[PDB]
Each structure stands twice: as structure tokens, then as C-alpha cells.
């Protein structure tokens, strides 16, 4: 039979419909009154979190992040430039908003490592994502067989290196075949043409 979770999931398929529609209109008011990075006791999308690797365990933290919407907040050239590069308004960053969030959340927690993340909506100018972060030093995590991999030294500052969930997707690493020529094994190693 359907898991209770299956219902949360189901409501977040159409966030502008039914009850969740009214919850958002509610929360988003308290959300806009909160800081950029706010730690929360429980994920607003439980199926989503658990699906991403979340557990109700010591050493596991979740947080909401607000980032501005739109393109790049870019300054106009102060020196010579050819028309092609005189651009400002239509320049958009190459790192999606979800990925900025994950980072701002990570910095707020210097000892923690990003496990994954998910969007929790947006209004006219914010974009919210909740980020799951793990304490790689807390035993209970060091002793958990499904998370202890994040404890490894080789994982220090995952987000900042794009080893995150959205990190790899944004890096054009989804497909294993056609289209990932200049993507795999790394953008930089591919002359940065993807």
C-alpha cells in the first residue's frame, strides 16, 4: 500500500494546488521575515529529504536558504570591450540558484558537509531550498554504514568543489554518452567548454 510519505510527495507535485497551496501562502510570510540561513528541526519535505539521504539522527542537520531570483547581478565594464562583451542584463551565472544556496548554507556551518538539497518553493523574488548537512565528526554518523562515506578526508568541502548532487548535474555530468564530451571527467580538464 501507499506509504504516508507518498502523500507528501504527491502534494509537492502541484505546490500551487490544494492545501499545500495554502500552507505556502502562510509560511512564505514567516519565511520572508527570517534570515538567509535558518536551521530547522524538521524538513518541510520529509519524503524528499529521506529520499535524498536524510535520517532522524544525531549529526544530521537541515536548513532553509533564501537566494534572490533572476540573472546575474553584474557590473558594467569600466574599460575597453568589444560589443559582444559589453553585455550586462542578459548575462546569467553558470551556477544555478540551488547551488548557491547549498554553499551559503555550507559556509554558515563550517564543520558540516553538504549531503544534498531540494527546493521548497519561491515567491516573486526569493527562491528557497532546504539543505541537508552532515557532521562528519559526530560518531553515530562515523558509525553509520550508509553515511560514514562523507566522513572521509577526501570529502572536505564537497559543495565548493561541485561534488554535490546539484553540483554534478549543473556540471553537465548527467549523461554518460552523447553530449558529455567536454563534460566528463571534469570541465576544467576539458578546457572549460561545457
Amino acid at each position: 500500500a501507499r506509504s504516508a510519505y507518498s502523500y507528501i510527495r504527491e502534494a509537492w507535485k502541484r505546490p500551487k494546488e490544494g492545501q499545500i497551496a495554502e500552507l505556502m501562502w502562510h509560511r512564505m510570510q514567516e519565511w520572508r521575515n527570517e534570515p538567509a540561513v535558518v536551521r530547522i528541526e524538521r524538513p518541510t519535505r520529509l519524503d524528499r529529504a529521506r529520499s535524498l539521504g536524510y535520517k532522524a539522527k544525531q549529526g544530521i542537520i537541515v536548513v532553509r536558504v533564501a537566494i534572490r531570483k533572476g540573472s546575474s547581478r553584474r557590473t558594467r565594464f569600466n574599460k575597453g570591450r568589444r560589443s559582444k562583451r559589453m553585455m550586462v542584463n542578459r548575462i546569467t551565472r553558470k551556477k544555478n540558484i540551488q547551488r548557491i544556496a547549498e554553499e551559503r548554507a555550507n559556509r554558515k556551518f563550517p564543520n558540516l558537509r553538504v549531503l544534498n538539497s531540494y527546493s521548497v518553493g519561491e515567491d516573486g523574488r526569493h527562491k528557497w531550498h532546504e539543505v541537508i548537512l552532515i557532521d562528519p565528526d559526530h560518531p553515530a554518523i562515523k558509525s553509520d554504514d550508509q553515511l560514514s562515506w562523507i566522513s572521509r578526508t577526501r570529502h572536505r568541502l564537497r559543495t565548493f568543489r561541485g561534488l554535490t548532487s546539484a553540483g554534478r548535474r549543473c556540471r553537465g555530468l548527467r549523461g554518460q554518452g552523447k553530449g558529455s564530451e567536454k563534460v566528463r571527467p571534469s570541465l576544467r580538464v576539458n578546457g572549460a567548454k561545457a
Partner: protein, 92 residues
């Protein structure tokens, strides 16, 4: 100049002389689905667009004869060399 609406001449398809009708080639409307349409859309961006940033050439003092020669029996038309004519009016 003047030029007969109809007249006997060689047809390339029938492979024999017969009555042909002369008409001026009406321009045909584009579908905006050719390869140059998609490269324009694609290649155009911030700043200059290169070739796509250029504008209409100009006009020669006079144009050449842009006609059609339609055979009176098989109905198939054939194109001929055009000749500089400041004006071309058909007779009937």
C-alpha cells in the same frame, strides 16, 4: 520595351516549337524554416551579430528581364537569360 504576351518558340520539355506564354516571375513567399533562418536565430546574441548585423545592399540603375516561359500544351515553364530592360510591357 514591348513584348508579346504569347508567341511560338522552342520548348525544352516537349522538345519542339509550340506557343508559349510570357509572364513576369512573381516572388515566392518564404517559410522562415530554411537553414539560414535557424543560423540567424542561433548565432544572434549580445552586441553585433556579424553578417546578420548588415542591411539591404542597393539597386542597379536598371534590372534584367525576370520572366517565365510557359508552353501552351504541356503547361511546363522554362527560364531564359534576362536582359537589361528599364521597362517591359506585354502586347495583349
Amino acid at each position: 520595351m514591348q513584348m508579346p504576351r504569347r508567341f511560338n518558340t522552342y520548348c525544352p520539355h516537349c522538345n519542339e516549337h509550340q506557343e508559349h506564354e510570357v509572364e513576369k516571375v512573381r516572388s515566392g513567399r518564404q517559410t522562415g524554416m530554411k537553414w539560414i533562418d535557424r543560423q540567424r536565430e542561433r548565432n544572434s546574441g549580445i552586441g553585433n551579430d556579424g553578417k546578420f548585423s548588415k542591411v539591404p545592399g542597393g539597386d542597379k540603375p536598371t534590372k534584367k528581364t525576370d520572366l517565365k516561359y510557359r508552353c501552351g500544351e504541356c503547361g511546363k515553364a522554362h527560364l531564359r537569360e534576362g536582359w537589361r530592360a528599364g521597362r517591359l510591357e506585354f502586347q495583349e
